[PDB]
């Protein structure tokens, strides 16, 4: 197993910025791809981004040019800078972990951390 413990979200308003963080611990194979994604009310769950461990990234297409992926790997640690934050990036974030276990595919979730943006909290 992969834990996953994340960190970082709370209430922001419209343009502002957040960082969230996920911690991993646990059997981390050499080979795996760690994942933010987000679940708001009236919406399926959400890829935001994505890294492999040499960094390559993708993003979703909603949050290109405002969200940014990283690490701290003396942490073991995977971070999501949230920049121009809108009203519907509203959600509950979560880090996720991919990676092979001896009888297939394993996605690993951390618990969440909410994220909400708004103007008239």
């Known amino acids: 197993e992969v834990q996953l413990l994340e960190s970082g979200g709370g209430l922001v308003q419209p343009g502002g910025s957040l960082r969230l963080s996920c911690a991993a611990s646990?059997?981390?194979?050499?080979?795996?791809?760690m994942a933010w994604f987000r679940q708001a009310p009236g919406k399926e769950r959400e890829l935001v981004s994505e890294?492999?461990?040499?960094?390559?990234?993708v993003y979703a297409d909603s949050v290109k040019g405002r969200f940014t992926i990283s690490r701290d790997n003396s942490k073991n640690t995977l971070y999501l800078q949230m920049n121009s934050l809108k009203p519907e990036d509203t959600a509950v974030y979560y880090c996720?972990?991919?990676?092979?276990?001896?009888?297939?595919?394993?996605?690993?979730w951390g618990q969440g951390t909410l994220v909400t943006v708004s103007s008239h909290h």
């Open positions: 890294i492999s461990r040499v960094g390559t990234t």
């Open positions: 996720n972990a991919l990676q092979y276990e001896k009888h297939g595919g394993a996605d690993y």
């Open positions: 646990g059997r981390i194979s050499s080979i795996i791809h």
